[PDB]
Design a protein around this ligand. Structure first.
Ligand SMILES: [Mg+2]
Length: 459
């Protein structure tokens, strides 16, 4: 008989809560019981378990493991590793199920779970099903096992064996005191680089900057060090290693959709007609670029589980999100992995005589706004999107409603979507000229005001 857990920690692509508040030891135990039960129902008793470098790790993980064991599961405990290393374990060990205890890039007090059951990364109704299992006491009982597995050397060797760097490179590596520090600098050195480490000590206090390369302020130290040491590239990993941020030898921030251009060109060169996936926040230039090299561009929803699901459904060889998650299936396993993506980036760059600044600057660049945020209310945020979906007029724009409202015009595009976690509307605009940009911003401004003439529109 299980206690009542807070419904709110069961999110779209993970479970996440505040340790000792909405996420306790008991909470973790029953989460383990729910996952092990679902894994057994899909014919999979074997479950890998990994944890990131958070302070609550070594001890919340005990409850997660005991929960799985009390279902009768055979647990492979891989210890403290990056998230993509846990995903790797769940591809190469006996079982195709895995649980990663991680709070990703959040402040120190947060922790949570990313879940793969019988090959499938859970999302949405599948995660609410785990919650429903606990509420209903619909849970397996058994006497399981625990085996310690040391998987990091095998992962390290798998990548080193696959990657062939052509010239030596000097690379600044910023791990933000997250778990990527267990492997990224060592691996990049082993590839044939000189590595200048920044915040590579694992420290769940995050005493420097939080490991979140999605926010440019967290790249300041990296940019400064790249310039100061005349390095060829700078790399920044998020806390659990599934995302990577890139800066050139001159300190230019390379956004994930532009990084995906380089990877798409590379993957499609070996794989005529390959599907390539990108999310609704990515530049329209990526559509044309994938098409021109003979690939099949596929736009999809944001969210790691949803990308991986779409990968399996389409046979796509590569995917990327604007979050910085890059998903290689070609030569790899199809999951998001910042470390492997860094390695694949270094392989390509090592083969070009130009510096990283010039490799990236050669791609088409349009006029783009930064990401625009409008604070609305929790009551109104989804309804504003729905009102637009019902009644907005966009001329000849090609409308995509996969995730908010995106409109593609011949020479530019715009997106508005509701944040899943904050009372905020998130917008982006791009076009090839200033005049066209103003036209696109105006259509979106007019359509929002048609919903509510009192909405703040700061553009
Ligand atoms: Mg992450």
């Amino acid at each position: 008989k299980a206690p009542t857990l807070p419904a709110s920690i069961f999110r779209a692509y993970d479970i996440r809560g505040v340790v000792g508040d909405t996420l306790t030891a008991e909470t973790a135990y029953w989460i383990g019981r729910a996952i092990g039960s679902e894994s057994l129902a899909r014919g999979e008793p074997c479950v890998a378990v990994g944890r990131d470098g958070r302070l609550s790790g070594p001890e919340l993980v005990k409850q997660l493991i005991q929960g799985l064991v009390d279902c009768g599961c055979q647990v492979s405990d891989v210890g403290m590793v990056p998230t993509p290393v846990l995903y790797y374990a769940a591809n190469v060990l006996e079982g195709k199920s895995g649980v990663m205890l991680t709070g990703s890039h959040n402040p120190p007090d947060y922790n949570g779970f990313k879940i793969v059951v019988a090959g499938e990364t859970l999302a949405n109704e599948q995660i609410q099903a785990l919650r429903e299992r606990i509420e209903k006491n619909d849970l397996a009982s058994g006497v399981g096992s625990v085996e310690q597995v040391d998987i990091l050397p095998r992962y390290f060797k798998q990548i080193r064996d696959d990657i062939a760097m052509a010239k030596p490179m000097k690379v600044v590596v910023d791990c933000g005191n997250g778990v990527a520090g267990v492997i990224a600098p060592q691996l990049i050195e082993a590839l044939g680089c000189s590595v200048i480490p920044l915040y590579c000590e694992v420290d769940g206090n995050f005493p420097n900057h939080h490991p979140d390369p999605g926010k440019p302020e967290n790249l300041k130290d990296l940019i400064a060090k790249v310039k100061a040491e005349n390095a060829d590239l700078g790399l920044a990993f998020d806390g659990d290693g599934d995302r990577v941020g890139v800066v050139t030898n001159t300190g230019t921030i390379i956004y994930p959709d532009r990084l995906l251009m380089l990877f798409a060109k590379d993957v499609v060169s070996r794989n005529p007609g390959a599907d390539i996936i990108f999310d609704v926040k990515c530049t329209r230039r990526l559509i044309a670029l994938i098409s021109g090299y003979g690939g099949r561009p596929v736009m999809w929803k944001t969210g790691h589980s949803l990308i991986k699901k779409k990968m399996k459904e389409t046979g796509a060889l590569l995917a990327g999100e604007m979050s910085g998650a890059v998903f290689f299936k070609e030569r790899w396993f199809g999951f998001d992995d910042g470390i492997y993506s860094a390695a694949r980036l270094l392989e390509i760059l090592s083969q070009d005589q130009r510096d990283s600044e010039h490799v990236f600057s050669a791609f088409p660049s349009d006029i783009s706004t930064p990401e625009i945020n409008i604070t609305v209310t929790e009551d109104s945020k989804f309804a504003i999107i729905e009102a637009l979906q019902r009644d907005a007029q966009w001329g000849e724009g090609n409308i995509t409603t996969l995730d908010g409202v995106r409109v593609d015009y011949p020479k530019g595009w715009g997106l508005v979507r509701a944040s899943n976690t904050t009372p905020v509307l998130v917008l982006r605009f791009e076009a090839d000229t200033e005049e066209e940009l103003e036209r696109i911003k105006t259509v979106f401004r007019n359509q929002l005001k048609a919903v509510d003439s009192s909405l703040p529109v700061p553009f």
